[PDB]
């Protein structure tokens, strides 16, 4: 098994299961996480809060809707009608 | 940097645990905190 | 209030006709003057800062704010945030009176062949000039001073370019 040649890099960290966690159109309950991220790839919208780890979660019960903010930004909102 | 126990000056209880740098803060730090025994904010000291 | 009256009595009269202005507002009004000394070798010392305080504290009527070094310049010991440089701006009647005194005391100690100089310019209408603390403090003698420095002076005017600055220097200045 080879010899004195060895590698200095076989390291990685544990992957964090980030990304979207709910879909447009589906009803969710309040407190449901909608999007895990680092920084703000997606901003909180209507009735959506932003956690200390930048997690986006629903504030009330209702349907989730991803929307544009302006030219190059996105947001997620929750709307009450059920 | 060392651990610190903050003891209520009035109640007497050791209510909070925090940290400090022993060179930047070479004294017994004091700050106002909520003593749950007396239901009020009292002075706590590093004791 | 000498050049204060002189503006509206001679400059707003003659410059308004030498260069045409449709309304009375393009009369190039001198706004303020900045008198930053510059940089002294004030890294092993911290007292020539107080001397540059006494100057510009005594000549002009305001103590100079000691602006700190923005970046950590190499070679010389410039720590980001290490104090080098003074600054005062005159705007009101103090500005007029300071200019009037300056044009009355520049030439005697300046020894300038022109009288002050011809042009040291940023190509846009302001001095950023150099001095050797000769013309300044006629009020207080040289016997009580410690160094030799010269301020970075400019002219903030409603004018546009150095061409107009030459026309406006006619107020007992020497272009």
């Amino acid at each position: 098994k080879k010899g004195v040649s060895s590698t200095k890099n076989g390291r990685d960290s544990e992957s964090k299961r980030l990304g979207a966690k709910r879909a447009d159109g589906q009803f969710v309950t309040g407190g449901s996480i909608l999007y895990r991220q680092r920084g703000t790839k997606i901003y909180p919208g209507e009735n959506v809060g932003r956690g200390g780890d930048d997690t986006l979660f629903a504030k009330i019960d209702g349907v989730v809707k991803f929307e544009r903010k302006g030219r190059d930004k996105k947001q997620v909102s929750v709307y009450a009608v059920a | 940097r060392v651990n610190v126990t903050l003891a209520c000056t009035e109640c007497g209880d050791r209510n909070y645990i925090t940290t400090k740098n022993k060179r930047n803060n070479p004294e017994r730090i004091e700050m106002k905190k909520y003593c749950p025994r007396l239901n009020k904010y009292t002075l706590h000291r590093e004791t | 209030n000498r050049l204060k009256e002189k503006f509206n009595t001679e400059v707003t009269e003659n410059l308004m006709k030498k260069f045409n202005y449709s309304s009375v507002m393009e009369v190039p009004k001198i706004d303020k003057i900045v008198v930053n000394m510059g940089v002294g070798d004030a890294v092993q010392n911290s007292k020539v800062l107080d001397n540059a305080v006494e100057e510009l504290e005594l000549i002009t009527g305001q103590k100079p704010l000691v602006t700190k070094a923005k970046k950590s310049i190499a070679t010389f010991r410039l720590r980001e945030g290490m104090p080098i440089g003074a600054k005062v701006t005159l705007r009101g009647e103090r500005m007029y009176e300071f200019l009037d005194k300056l044009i009355s005391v520049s030439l005697p100690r300046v020894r300038d062949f022109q009288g002050v100089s011809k042009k040291a310019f940023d190509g846009r209408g302001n001095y950023t000039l150099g001095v050797k603390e000769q013309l300044i403090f006629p009020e207080i003698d040289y016997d009580k001073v410690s160094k030799v420095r010269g301020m970075d002076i400019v002219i903030v005017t409603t004018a546009n370019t150095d061409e107009e600055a030459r026309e406006l220097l006619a107020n007992f200045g020497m272009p």
Binding site: - | - | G61, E97, I140
Partner: protein, 59 residues
């Protein structure tokens, strides 16, 4: 001004012998040698100057 930090200035009367260019100012709060009114009642600290006597361009 760059005020906030400021002592007492004054429009002093630099009434020198060379056209009395008392259109000047400074903190030279000395004794009023000539408490005149065409110029300020301040000290004529400017005593001798060539600013209006000998100009190497227009002498």
């Amino acid at each position: 001004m760059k005020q906030g930090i400021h002592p007492e200035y004054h429009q002093v009367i630099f009434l020198d012998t060379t056209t009395n260019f008392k259109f000047l100012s400074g903190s030279t709060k000395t004794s009023s040698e000539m408490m005149e009114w065409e110029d300020g009642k301040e000290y004529p600290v400017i005593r001798l100057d060539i600013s209006s006597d000998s100009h190497p361009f227009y002498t």
